[PDB]
Scaffold this motif. Sequence first.
Motif, PDB file in Angstrom:
ATOM      1  N   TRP A 299       0.857  -1.216   0.000  1.00 57.62           N
ATOM      2  CA  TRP A 299       0.000   0.000   0.000  1.00 57.62           C
ATOM      3  C   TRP A 299       0.881   1.250   0.000  1.00 57.62           C
ATOM      4  CZ3 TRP A 299      -4.573   1.501  -1.324  1.00 57.62           C
ATOM      5  CH2 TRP A 299      -5.094   2.707  -0.858  1.00 57.62           C
ATOM      6  N   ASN A 300       2.078   1.165   0.585  1.00 59.31           N
ATOM      7  CA  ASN A 300       2.946   2.366   0.714  1.00 59.31           C
ATOM      8  C   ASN A 300       3.915   2.466  -0.470  1.00 59.31           C
ATOM      9  OD1 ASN A 300       1.552   2.560   3.081  1.00 59.31           O
ATOM     10  ND2 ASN A 300       3.328   2.452   4.437  1.00 59.31           N
ATOM     11  N   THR A 301       3.714   1.658  -1.514  1.00 57.73           N
ATOM     12  CA  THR A 301       4.578   1.750  -2.722  1.00 57.73           C
ATOM     13  C   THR A 301       3.746   2.261  -3.905  1.00 57.73           C
ATOM     14  OG1 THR A 301       5.681  -0.154  -1.764  1.00 57.73           O
ATOM     15  CG2 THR A 301       6.484   0.548  -3.907  1.00 57.73           C
ATOM     16  N   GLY A 302       2.767   3.133  -3.646  1.00 62.27           N
ATOM     17  CA  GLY A 302       1.980   3.730  -4.744  1.00 62.27           C
ATOM     18  C   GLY A 302       1.352   2.702  -5.670  1.00 62.27           C
ATOM     19  N   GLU A 303       1.404   1.416  -5.308  1.00 68.75           N
ATOM     20  CA  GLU A 303       0.725   0.367  -6.114  1.00 68.75           C
ATOM     21  C   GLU A 303      -0.752   0.746  -6.250  1.00 68.75           C
ATOM     22  OE1 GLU A 303       1.787  -2.710  -7.372  1.00 68.75           O
ATOM     23  OE2 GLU A 303       3.846  -2.839  -6.621  1.00 68.75           O
ATOM     24  N   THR A 304      -1.371   0.451  -7.395  1.00 72.48           N
ATOM     25  CA  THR A 304      -2.777   0.888  -7.611  1.00 72.48           C
ATOM     26  C   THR A 304      -3.700  -0.333  -7.698  1.00 72.48           C
ATOM     27  OG1 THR A 304      -1.800   2.722  -8.796  1.00 72.48           O
ATOM     28  CG2 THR A 304      -4.192   2.533  -8.926  1.00 72.48           C
ATOM     29  N   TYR A 305      -4.849  -0.289  -7.014  1.00 73.63           N
ATOM     30  CA  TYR A 305      -5.808  -1.424  -7.012  1.00 73.63           C
ATOM     31  C   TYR A 305      -7.169  -0.932  -7.511  1.00 73.63           C
ATOM     32  CZ  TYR A 305      -2.183  -2.638  -3.589  1.00 73.63           C
ATOM     33  OH  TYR A 305      -0.991  -2.832  -2.938  1.00 73.63           O
ATOM     34  N   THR A 306      -7.937  -1.797  -8.181  1.00 72.05           N
ATOM     35  CA  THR A 306      -9.250  -1.382  -8.747  1.00 72.05           C
ATOM     36  C   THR A 306     -10.314  -2.446  -8.467  1.00 72.05           C
ATOM     37  OG1 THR A 306     -10.442  -0.776 -10.743  1.00 72.05           O
ATOM     38  CG2 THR A 306      -8.548  -2.227 -11.035  1.00 72.05           C
ATOM     39  N   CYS A 307     -11.592  -2.061  -8.512  1.00 69.52           N
ATOM     40  CA  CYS A 307     -12.703  -2.993  -8.188  1.00 69.52           C
ATOM     41  C   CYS A 307     -13.708  -3.004  -9.345  1.00 69.52           C
ATOM     42  CB  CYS A 307     -13.380  -2.544  -6.900  1.00 69.52           C
ATOM     43  SG  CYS A 307     -14.878  -3.463  -6.472  1.00 69.52           S
ATOM     44  N   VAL A 308     -13.470  -3.844 -10.357  1.00 67.74           N
ATOM     45  CA  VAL A 308     -14.386  -3.922 -11.535  1.00 67.74           C
ATOM     46  C   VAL A 308     -15.655  -4.681 -11.134  1.00 67.74           C
ATOM     47  CG1 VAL A 308     -12.597  -3.696 -13.316  1.00 67.74           C
ATOM     48  CG2 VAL A 308     -13.171  -5.965 -12.429  1.00 67.74           C
ATOM     49  N   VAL A 309     -16.807  -4.267 -11.667  1.00 66.61           N
ATOM     50  CA  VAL A 309     -18.095  -4.959 -11.364  1.00 66.61           C
ATOM     51  C   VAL A 309     -18.834  -5.219 -12.680  1.00 66.61           C
ATOM     52  CG1 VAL A 309     -18.292  -3.977  -9.032  1.00 66.61           C
ATOM     53  CG2 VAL A 309     -19.347  -2.791 -10.967  1.00 66.61           C
ATOM     54  N   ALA A 310     -19.743  -6.198 -12.692  1.00 65.10           N
ATOM     55  CA  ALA A 310     -20.527  -6.511 -13.909  1.00 65.10           C
ATOM     56  C   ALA A 310     -22.007  -6.661 -13.539  1.00 65.10           C
ATOM     57  CB  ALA A 310     -19.989  -7.764 -14.555  1.00 65.10           C
ATOM     58  N   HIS A 311     -22.890  -5.936 -14.232  1.00 63.06           N
ATOM     59  CA  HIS A 311     -24.350  -6.011 -13.951  1.00 63.06           C
ATOM     60  C   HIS A 311     -25.125  -5.748 -15.245  1.00 63.06           C
ATOM     61  CE1 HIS A 311     -28.215  -4.603 -11.907  1.00 63.06           C
ATOM     62  NE2 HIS A 311     -28.046  -5.843 -11.505  1.00 63.06           N
ATOM     63  N   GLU A 312     -26.351  -6.271 -15.338  1.00 62.49           N
ATOM     64  CA  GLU A 312     -27.171  -6.105 -16.567  1.00 62.49           C
ATOM     65  C   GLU A 312     -27.471  -4.620 -16.801  1.00 62.49           C
ATOM     66  OE1 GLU A 312     -30.611  -8.524 -15.829  1.00 62.49           O
ATOM     67  OE2 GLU A 312     -29.413 -10.314 -15.389  1.00 62.49           O
ATOM     68  N   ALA A 313     -27.786  -3.872 -15.741  1.00 64.50           N
ATOM     69  CA  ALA A 313     -28.172  -2.450 -15.904  1.00 64.50           C
ATOM     70  C   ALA A 313     -27.007  -1.638 -16.483  1.00 64.50           C
ATOM     71  CB  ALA A 313     -28.627  -1.887 -14.584  1.00 64.50           C
ATOM     72  N   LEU A 314     -25.776  -1.937 -16.058  1.00 65.57           N
ATOM     73  CA  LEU A 314     -24.587  -1.184 -16.542  1.00 65.57           C
ATOM     74  C   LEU A 314     -24.681  -1.021 -18.064  1.00 65.57           C
ATOM     75  CD1 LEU A 314     -21.671  -2.654 -14.396  1.00 65.57           C
ATOM     76  CD2 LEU A 314     -22.977  -0.548 -14.102  1.00 65.57           C
ATOM     77  N   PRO A 315     -24.588   0.214 -18.608  1.00 59.17           N
ATOM     78  CA  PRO A 315     -24.707   0.438 -20.050  1.00 59.17           C
ATOM     79  C   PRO A 315     -23.615  -0.334 -20.802  1.00 59.17           C
ATOM     80  CG  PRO A 315     -23.823   2.390 -18.937  1.00 59.17           C
ATOM     81  CD  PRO A 315     -24.350   1.454 -17.869  1.00 59.17           C
ATOM     82  N   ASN A 316     -22.380  -0.303 -20.290  1.00 59.41           N
ATOM     83  CA  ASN A 316     -21.262  -1.056 -20.920  1.00 59.41           C
ATOM     84  C   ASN A 316     -21.201  -2.448 -20.285  1.00 59.41           C
ATOM     85  OD1 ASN A 316     -19.260  -1.369 -22.810  1.00 59.41           O
ATOM     86  ND2 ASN A 316     -17.818   0.070 -21.884  1.00 59.41           N
ATOM     87  N   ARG A 317     -22.108  -2.739 -19.344  1.00 55.07           N
ATOM     88  CA  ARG A 317     -22.159  -4.059 -18.652  1.00 55.07           C
ATOM     89  C   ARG A 317     -20.964  -4.193 -17.701  1.00 55.07           C
ATOM     90  NH1 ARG A 317     -26.592  -3.168 -20.597  1.00 55.07           N
ATOM     91  NH2 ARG A 317     -27.914  -4.758 -21.573  1.00 55.07           N
ATOM     92  N   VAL A 318     -19.995  -3.275 -17.778  1.00 53.92           N
ATOM     93  CA  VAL A 318     -18.802  -3.316 -16.881  1.00 53.92           C
ATOM     94  C   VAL A 318     -18.401  -1.888 -16.509  1.00 53.92           C
ATOM     95  CG1 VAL A 318     -16.362  -3.974 -16.676  1.00 53.92           C
ATOM     96  CG2 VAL A 318     -17.949  -5.517 -17.832  1.00 53.92           C
ATOM     97  N   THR A 319     -18.154  -1.627 -15.222  1.00 53.08           N
ATOM     98  CA  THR A 319     -17.673  -0.293 -14.776  1.00 53.08           C
ATOM     99  C   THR A 319     -16.599  -0.512 -13.713  1.00 53.08           C
ATOM    100  OG1 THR A 319     -18.268   1.864 -13.937  1.00 53.08           O
ATOM    101  CG2 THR A 319     -19.418  -0.001 -12.953  1.00 53.08           C
ATOM    102  N   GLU A 320     -15.775   0.497 -13.431  1.00 54.33           N
ATOM    103  CA  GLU A 320     -14.670   0.265 -12.463  1.00 54.33           C
ATOM    104  C   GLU A 320     -14.325   1.551 -11.707  1.00 54.33           C
ATOM    105  OE1 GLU A 320     -10.831  -0.780 -13.771  1.00 54.33           O
ATOM    106  OE2 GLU A 320     -10.506   1.058 -14.925  1.00 54.33           O
ATOM    107  N   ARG A 321     -13.834   1.421 -10.469  1.00 58.92           N
ATOM    108  CA  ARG A 321     -13.371   2.593  -9.680  1.00 58.92           C
ATOM    109  C   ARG A 321     -11.949   2.257  -9.226  1.00 58.92           C
ATOM    110  NH1 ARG A 321     -18.339   5.790  -9.052  1.00 58.92           N
ATOM    111  NH2 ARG A 321     -19.749   4.584 -10.390  1.00 58.92           N
ATOM    112  N   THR A 322     -11.107   3.260  -8.969  1.00 56.47           N
ATOM    113  CA  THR A 322      -9.687   2.965  -8.639  1.00 56.47           C
ATOM    114  C   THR A 322      -9.187   3.908  -7.539  1.00 56.47           C
ATOM    115  OG1 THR A 322      -9.546   2.546 -11.002  1.00 56.47           O
ATOM    116  CG2 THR A 322      -7.491   2.384  -9.773  1.00 56.47           C
ATOM    117  N   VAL A 323      -8.366   3.405  -6.607  1.00 50.33           N
ATOM    118  CA  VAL A 323      -7.770   4.289  -5.557  1.00 50.33           C
ATOM    119  C   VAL A 323      -6.315   3.890  -5.302  1.00 50.33           C
ATOM    120  CG1 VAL A 323     -10.040   4.514  -4.411  1.00 50.33           C
ATOM    121  CG2 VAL A 323      -8.291   2.987  -3.440  1.00 50.33           C
TER     122      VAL A 323
END
Lengths: 231, 111, 109, 128, 103, 106
Positions: free
Chosen positions: A183-207
């Motif tokens: 966590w202290n080496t600027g490494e980046t992690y993301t949480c992709v999700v998949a749902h029928e409502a999603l227009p692209n069917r896939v969306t993601e957030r990153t911190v």
Amino acid sequence: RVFAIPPSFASIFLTKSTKLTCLVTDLTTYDSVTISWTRQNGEAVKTHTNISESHPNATFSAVGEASICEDDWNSGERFTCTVTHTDLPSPLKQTISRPKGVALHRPDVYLLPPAREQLNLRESATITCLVTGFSPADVFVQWMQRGQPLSPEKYVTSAPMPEPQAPGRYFAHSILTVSEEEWNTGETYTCVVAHEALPNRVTERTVDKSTGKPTLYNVSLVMSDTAGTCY
Amino acid sequence: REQLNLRESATITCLVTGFSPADVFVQWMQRGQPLSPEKYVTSAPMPEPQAPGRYFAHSILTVSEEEWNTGETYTCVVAHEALPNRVTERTVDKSTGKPTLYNVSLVMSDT
Amino acid sequence: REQLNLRESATITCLVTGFSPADVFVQWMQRGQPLSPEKYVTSAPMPEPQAPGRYFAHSILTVSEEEWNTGETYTCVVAHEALPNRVTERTVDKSTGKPTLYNVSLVMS
Amino acid sequence: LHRPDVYLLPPAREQLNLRESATITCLVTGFSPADVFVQWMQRGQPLSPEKYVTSAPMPEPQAPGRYFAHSILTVSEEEWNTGETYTCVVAHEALPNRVTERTVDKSTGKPTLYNVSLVMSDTAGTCY
Amino acid sequence: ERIVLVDNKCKCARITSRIIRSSEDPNEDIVERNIRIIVPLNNRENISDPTSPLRTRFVYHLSDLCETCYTYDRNKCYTAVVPLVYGGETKMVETALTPDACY
Amino acid sequence: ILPEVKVEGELGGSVTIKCPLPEMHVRIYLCREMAGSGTCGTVVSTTNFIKAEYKGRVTLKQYPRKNLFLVEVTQLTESDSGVYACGAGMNTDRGKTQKVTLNVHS
Ligand SMILES: *[C@@H]1O[C@H](CO)[C@@H](O[C@@H]2O[C@H](CO)[C@@H](O)[C@H](O)[C@H]2NC(C)=O)[C@H](O)[C@H]1NC(C)=O
Ligand SMILES: *[C@@H]1O[C@H](CO)[C@@H](O)[C@H](O)[C@H]1NC(C)=O
Ligand SMILES: *[C@@H]1O[C@H](CO)[C@@H](O)[C@H](O)[C@H]1NC(C)=O
Ligand SMILES: *[C@@H]1O[C@H](CO)[C@@H](O)[C@H](O)[C@H]1NC(C)=O
Ligand SMILES: *[C@@H]1O[C@H](CO)[C@@H](O)[C@H](O)[C@H]1NC(C)=O
């Protein structure tokens, strides 16, 4: 015990080789067993070969799959799964009906960084991912680190649960644990999700370390030629 | 922070981890007064992958965005059969993740 | 502040006020480990002057300034007989109320 | 053979202190070979030829093949409270669009009161 | 009253101008020029790639306004590709980085 | 800037509010922005929400054909006065599209 698992949208949308599975367990070992599928009008569909091997603890473990049109599933046609055994002369009949779709809604995805007090211990950090307010259920969530997917065993995903404030709405959680150094080496992690409502069917957030509730706002505001020629 | 831009609701999460065995108990209250039990939901103890036999749980509470902004504090209490007092509390409010300091540097020029 | 410009020790006080009746129990624990009762003292329930039919107590903890500048949440638990579940606690650390600091560096030209 | 560069200038600051009139100058330079004339239109309506006075093409101080010309126009001082922008124009064969309408207004020019108001937030990720 | 010289949405700069009337006279009509930039602070360097480090330096050449970008636009969709290993099958899928604006 | 339509009540009992309906947006709110801080507090919005005080006296009917949406509020009291806004997007402030005023002569 006869277990039936319907195909998941995360399997349909990603493989296009959809199938439905009935499995039997906790049953005396006995060869010459027939697995069949029945619709509401009595038509039979082809059951596939390559039945699963029995479990080492002297009980059944079988796989039975068949293909039915996705439009047929969307039509909400009731389907029945049956298995035959000599122990129980009456075959066991179970329903794998797909209830079409209730009002569809998009899942808000909020991702939160580890708590400040936790980092004080300098042991390990836990990152969460709170999906919220999606109807219907069966959301699919995965984690990758700097463009490389992680093992499914390094994180845990909850199951959809009712929402007291919102009738007919569901939410789910997901947590990933890593060492403090990572966590202290600027490494980046993301949480992709998949749902029928999603227009692209896939969306993601990153911190990352800098974006998750930072302690410094380092800024280098610089402008030039303010006069210039503007029209 | 994004959830707040909608000006509708807010979700505080209480995360309990590392305990063994199961059967922990979580309750929500503010300023010492217990909160109604129909406003929060708690997960059952779930196994921890790396841990040999330790478990974890999590609870969430939904409050009005206004209430959060008003400045009210919300405390979360857990009761397990292993804590020396068998009770523990934590606390979060608006003043938790505020940026400690700014370091702006304007360099206005005409050339 | 002036205590810390000595580099020898600091004292943390846990004021308890307005309770009734007496026999309150206070002890100091660091990150979940209770500390030895010799490391701190405690006052005795004495009446509140302006508030009738009331009491208040005190407790201080001596601690090295070397380790106070590194963390050590240092919570103060109190055990009265009228609390919602008979136990409460609070904690303060070196950064309990540090405020926001601006460092504007205009290079106006 | 080069693009005919053109420019326009507003009346002088000290000129707006006698309250008689004002002059606006449209400078046309380049246009090799020398083929230009200017018509001063306002609001799309050409002005009288007696107002603007174009003179001649003149070679630039150092003239390999380049030339230049100057054309001014006279207006009334009291009409500058509204501007009207008094547009200029040039024409040449070495131009893809054979027109380079050039116009200025009291508003256009040197500013005398800069009012920068920059703001810093964390919800400005999207420009609403 | 104010005319708009710049309405950039990538840099959120709104350059405008106005001339204020003097104290009942046509002289010393001082002109004005208002500039309003809104720094993002929480955006990345490569706005269309959620892996580049955070955006620290902000350079504003006002002449160009009146290509690296700073903010998003309320009228557009941003997308990318990510690998998914469902059933041990690495697969690239288009992901709506900025959802609710891709509908 | 966008219009500043104003409406009145002429004694309590009923009131009707109309605002333009934008396209390609799923959220619609009528926050009152009647706070000292200024931060608008969403009163009645889509995406499922409502005001703790305003309940049973607030409803929304979106009409894409007329490019308008309609909100009907029954009765009237002293609290539900002042000004109101309308908008879309996922940011109650910075997403407004009108500034309507509500008053009652009672
Ligand atoms: C910022 O990110 C974009 C997207 O990854 C980069 O452009 C892409 O480059 C890859 C090959 O490296 C192509 O497959 C994509 O088609 C490109 N995107 C587009 C929209 O054409 C871009 O180079 C990055 N910028 C920097 C400075 O690294
Ligand atoms: C802060 O900005 C300066 C330049 O203004 C830079 O030298 C320094 O590395 C920055 N801080 C961090 C932590 O990157
Ligand atoms: C603070 O700003 C100054 C001036 O830009 C810079 O030299 C310094 O590195 C900055 N500090 C950090 C921690 O970024
Ligand atoms: C504060 O500003 C000064 C002057 O720019 C700089 O030298 C110093 O590093 C800054 N401090 C921090 C913490 O950024
Ligand atoms: C300067 O800008 C601020 C912010 O827009 C505004 O309030 C103020 O009136 C402006 N001053 C002038 C003289 O226009």
